[PDB]
């Protein structure tokens, strides 16, 4: 479609620190790609982000019932919605699937890769460590970083650059809040 | 220092006359409101057992967003949106094993306006069995995220494509996937 488009977009953001002890409420307004005005709970009033948000800064700050509503949002809206979903969002725990497989080097390099895939876990906070005969490998460890799957799960690929020698035992160790003791998958040449 | 972030993201677009209302928690959709049906649609069905949402609140907000769009369009001297094309990434839910169920993920990121046509292509042919998708998810800036899914049975024979259509792209973007 060639026809021109006009977009009005709004985000009402609740930022939580130390549970609900410290909250930052952000009422943002966007026109097309431009954020024009916003309400910051720290500021306590509406402020124009650009020139286009100036009539809203003057008008929304004079609307006393609307300004008091925004000032009370940290408790009546932010803290309230945190509690409503707490058991299945904040406290949500999905245990990971740990897969260890050898990989081909791109192209022929001195070292081959040993991939530790950690999938289907929640939350995002995870510790993935590589071991060589009980000793932790700190060098030659390559990670794709944290991959969000968009379905309340995460994944990560933690590679080890090594030469399969001696008859060694390689071990990937996984630590996640969903499990009490670290998870391990052993691999041998 | 930030622990968690809850975002209520809402939009209205002209001339399409289409709106959307959703709640986001740490980048994940909690729920969205079905504008046509006047229904709350939970991302994971267990969410509806512990929490609830009155869909009327979303629709009342959308009427205001529409009115605000009308005002903002006039205020900007009728300036249309500059289309930002998306970055498309195709991946799997877990490592690939032959004949073992897996999920293909199509991640569409950094785009505006929030309008796409996403078709999954198995050997160049469209597939709609088991397909699922998120709504247009919020980002730190003015741009949008979206996830599309295709549950599949891995084979050496079968090849895959995610065809994404956006007004910022001159040609429909096809991101390919195949075994090894």
């Amino acid at each position: 479609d060639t026809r021109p488009r006009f977009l009005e977009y709004s985000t009402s953001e609740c930022h939580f620190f130390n549970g609900t002890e410290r909250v930052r409420f952000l009422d943002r307004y966007f026109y097309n790609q431009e954020e024009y005005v916003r309400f910051d709970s720290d500021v306590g009033e509406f402020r124009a982000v650009t020139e286009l948000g100036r009539p809203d800064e003057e008008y929304w700050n004079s609307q006393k019932d609307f300004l008091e509503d925004r000032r009370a949002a940290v408790d009546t809206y932010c803290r309230h919605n945190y509690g409503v979903g707490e058991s299945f969002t904040v406290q949500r725990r999905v245990h990971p699937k740990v897969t260890v497989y050898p990989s081909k080097t791109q192209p022929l390099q001195h070292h081959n890769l040993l991939v530790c895939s950690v999938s289907g876990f929640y939350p995002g906070s995870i510790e993935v460590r590589w071991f060589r005969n009980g000793q932790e490998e700190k060098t030659g460890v390559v990670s794709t970083g944290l991959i969000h799957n968009g379905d309340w799960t995460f994944q990560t690929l933690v590679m080890l650059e090594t030469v399969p020698r001696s008859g060694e035992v390689y071990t990937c160790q996984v630590e996640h809040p969903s499990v009490t003791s670290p998870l391990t998958v052993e691999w041998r040449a | 220092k930030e622990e968690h972030v809850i975002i209520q993201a809402e939009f209205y677009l002209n001339p399409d006359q289409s709106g959307e209302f959703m709640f986001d928690f740490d980048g994940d959709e909690i729920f969205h409101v079905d504008m046509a049906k006047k229904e709350t649609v939970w991302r994971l069905e267990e969410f509806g057992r512990f929490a609830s949402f009155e869909a009327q609140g979303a629709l009342a907000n959308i009427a205001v967003d529409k009115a605000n769009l009308e005002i903002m369009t006039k205020r900007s001297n009728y300036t249309p949106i500059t289309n930002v094309p998306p970055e498309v990434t195709v991946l799997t839910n877990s490592p690939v094993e032959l004949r073992e169920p897996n999920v293909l993920i199509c991640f569409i990121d950094k785009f505006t306006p929030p309008v796409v046509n996403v078709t999954w292509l198995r050997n160049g042919k469209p597939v709609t069995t088991g397909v699922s998708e998120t709504v247009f998810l919020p980002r730190e800036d003015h741009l949008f995220r979206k996830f599309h899914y295709l549950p599949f049975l891995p084979s050496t024979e079968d090849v895959y494509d995610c065809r994404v259509e956006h007004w910022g792209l001159d040609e429909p973007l096809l991101k390919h996937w195949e075994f090894d």
């Binding site: 009422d27 929304w60 | 609140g57 009342a60 907000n61 205001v64």
Partner: peptide, 16 residues
Amino acid sequence: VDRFYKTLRAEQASQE
């Protein structure tokens, strides 16, 4: 016990 998510109500912009 309120197990309901609350909507942050929208207000009409300035027509000036």
